[PDB]
Amino acid sequence: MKLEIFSWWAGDEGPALEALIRLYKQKYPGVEVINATVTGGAGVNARAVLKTRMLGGDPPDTFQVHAGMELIGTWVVANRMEDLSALFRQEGWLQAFPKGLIDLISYKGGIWSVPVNIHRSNVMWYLPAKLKGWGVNPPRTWDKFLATCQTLKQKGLEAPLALGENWTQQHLWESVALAVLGPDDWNNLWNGKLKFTDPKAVRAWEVFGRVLDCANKDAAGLSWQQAVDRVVQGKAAFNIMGDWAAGYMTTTLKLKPGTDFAWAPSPGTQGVFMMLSDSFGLPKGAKNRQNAINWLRLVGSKEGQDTSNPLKGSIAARLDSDPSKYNAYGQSAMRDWRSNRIVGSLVHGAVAPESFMSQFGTVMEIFLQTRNPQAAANAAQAIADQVGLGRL
Ligand SMILES: OC[C@H]1O[C@@H](O)[C@H](O)[C@@H](O)[C@H]1O
Fold it and tell me: Hey, which of 63, 224, 280, 333 has its CA 20 to 30 A from 38?
């Protein structure tokens, strides 16, 4: 009796998963659980290893996958996943999750994964006591961000913005783009109604370049956790990162939400929640099909989600989630999830297929070397044209 769970929740990302696995083993003492993590932030490495496994005809029993175009445009369109519609009926999940989330996991009459959480992409992290020590406020717009960072440089803080490796630069970019475009024109990139070469979308790169000039110059070789660490250390004032950062700071670093660290929407994005969702499905050919199905039933349940998510920094995907199980951050995110305008993340798989996502890092490289907004815009448009962005 075995179950092989594939994810990128290695190292200090693992507590939430490990808690779920312990729950699973209580319920199913027969099963030996193989925790098959591929180490690498945002699944860049996991994507590559999964590709080798799937094309080699050696699927894991289940794998971490983002709800939306990431899921649909890769293993679903390739006819490598089982339709979970019957399981959804069995478990009452069509009423348990918000309709918009069901839509992201649904395609051509099937339902293809089970959401375990909701993460938010557009969060700015800072330390209220450090900000007071520097005599500044948290910025609510990109203009105020840039002005505050200049003030901070004058006060001796060389790199007021913490930043890491390539994907985290893309991560920062999607917050900047959302602020510059607003939610409607953000959405219009992904349905092809707004071109990347439109002046409105070229401006995202202009603002992004200015913001980049506030960042640590060693960013390229740092993990997302190391970039958060710079803020905790006061070697930076701000970091733009998903709320897995809240999980890190509380679960791993034991910081108190609200006093030892704080949060706001990314500048210019207040009232908009840029979401992503980690989900698990059922690959065809799974060696341990029933054990995988029982894992899906667990990760889709209130018991599972309210055990794991408080550790993770995400909120539950289930509508019936108990807010008393969440700290001050989780409760704040829960409120915003219900009240805000929702849009999807690019970097975390909601809005664009992997064909585009995987090439966007190249676009980002060419912005870092040229610092030319038009070149970056033109590059993103060329990729969009090559992959037929909007066709799925
Ligand atoms: O690695 C950092 C993060 O990457 C996201 O793509 C993922 O959805 C999160 O669960 C977390 O793992």
Answer: 333
